[model samples]
Target: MDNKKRLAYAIIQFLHDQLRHGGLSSDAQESLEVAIQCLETAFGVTVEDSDLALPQTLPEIFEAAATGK
Candidate 1:
């Protein structure tokens, strides 16, 4: 499997969660939506490809990084 594709899938997945709960203005939300589409196009990835997912979500990864765990 392509690591770049997996990374792209992770980013798109994370952006989707943010779109739902980031509490941004409509303009910001729309921009995120566009970015999601752009990633999918540029990387040939989609959230439906579950196999591309890492064991952890992006937030979990960030948490690990922040705590240096």
Candidate 2:
């Protein structure tokens, strides 16, 4: 029932990880933060809900797709 919410949560989680490990600069970091906030508000999800996260993060999925693996 909450697949959409879970997907949103996964995306937000990915963004949060990026904030720390993606090596984004100041402006990009601010924009990424805003993007996360917007996604959370739109999907009614928060970082506290770890159960909403999928097994694979957005980047992991993207890597798999890009690598065709």
Candidate 3:
């Protein structure tokens, strides 16, 4: 996947895992969604359904978020 897509997926997966693990609150979830939206806008990429799946590496995720993929 492209960097933007990978980043979006990674963030969503991370948040989902956090929620599942009881590490994320409703406010945090909403914040993450907003952050994802911002990233989407910055990268000009639409988030796909599969993007919510877990990512394999932090570097890949960081690349997506940092570079706006």
Per-model C-alpha lDDT, please?
0.78, 0.80, 0.62
Task: Compute the lDDT of residue 28 as modeled in candidate 1.
Answer: 97
User: What is candidate 1's lDDT per residue for 1-69, written digit by digit as tens?
Assistant: 577777777777877887998767789999989988998989888666666578877656766887795
TM-scores for all predictions: 0.71, 0.70, 0.41
Who is ahead in lDDT, 2 or 3?
Answer: 2
Judge candidate 1 against the unseen true structure and give its global Cα lDDT, from 0 to 1.
0.78
Q: How well is each residue in 1-69 modelled by candidate 3, as lDDT tens digits? A: 665666555665565566567676788877866776676666565546355545474545567887895
lDDT of 3: 0.62
| Comparison by lDDT, 1 against 2, better one | 2
Model 3: per-residue Cα lDDT at residue 39: 65
Q: Of the candidates shown, which would achieve the greatest lDDT relative to the real structure? A: 2
